Amino acid sequence: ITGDVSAANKDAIRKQMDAAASKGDVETYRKLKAKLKGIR
């Protein structure tokens, strides 16, 4: 089912963020984080 509302989406984004976050490429992490902080 394509019902991956923020519940699922958030999770996915989280992984990508965590990786690029504490991995050196914090650039993408920061950006993503911001958006996630506004995800209505």
Side-chain angles (χ1 to χ4, degrees):
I1 183 184
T2 197
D4 257 357
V5 182
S6 52
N9 244 340
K10 186 152 144 203
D11 208 87
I13 290 164
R14 240 121 191 285
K15 226 175 243 250
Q16 235 158 7
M17 265 231 301
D18 214 321
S22 313
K23 174 129 219 222
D25 215 39
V26 185
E27 196 151 343
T28 287
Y29 177 37
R30 226 158 145 178
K31 235 173 134 142
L32 253 99
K33 211 189 174 224
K35 238 158 104 154
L36 190 107
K37 188 187 177 307
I39 283 186
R40 201 62 248 287

